[PDB]
Design an enzyme around this catalytic site. Sequence first.
Site, PDB file in Angstrom:
ATOM      1  N   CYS A  32      36.725   6.025 -25.807  1.00 48.61           N
ATOM      2  CA  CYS A  32      35.732   6.262 -26.841  1.00 48.61           C
ATOM      3  C   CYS A  32      36.280   7.645 -27.742  1.00 48.61           C
ATOM      4  CB  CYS A  32      34.382   6.430 -26.312  1.00 48.61           C
ATOM      5  SG  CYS A  32      33.174   7.265 -27.291  1.00 48.61           S
ATOM      6  N   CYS A  35      33.437  10.544 -28.493  1.00 48.72           N
ATOM      7  CA  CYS A  35      33.370  11.226 -27.008  1.00 48.72           C
ATOM      8  C   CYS A  35      34.002  12.006 -26.864  1.00 48.72           C
ATOM      9  CB  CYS A  35      33.292  10.092 -25.746  1.00 48.72           C
ATOM     10  SG  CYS A  35      32.280   8.705 -25.913  1.00 48.72           S
TER      11      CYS A  35
END
Length: 106
Positions: A32, A35
């Site tokens: 991700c 993230c």
Amino acid sequence: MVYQVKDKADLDGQLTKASGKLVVLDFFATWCGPCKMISPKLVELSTQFADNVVVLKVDVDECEDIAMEYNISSMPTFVFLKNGVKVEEFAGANAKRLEDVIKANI
């Protein structure tokens, strides 16, 4: 300062030790982009509020059962808890929002 839980049991102990401090759960994934993009900020806030905040990271690929249990579907998802009660929760990498929440509920 930012601890990554091993499993549910681990999470259920970190929360206990936490006691009455603001707990921030960072549900994320190593694939991700957003993230990773906010990880540094989380670290900064983590130490900037050590003593009154406890940041726990939860990897969704490693702890999938905890991901289902907390009903996560978007990463990163930040769940804020305090004394065993969800104080708030939102997904996304809005750094300002993140500091707002920790600060306001510390």
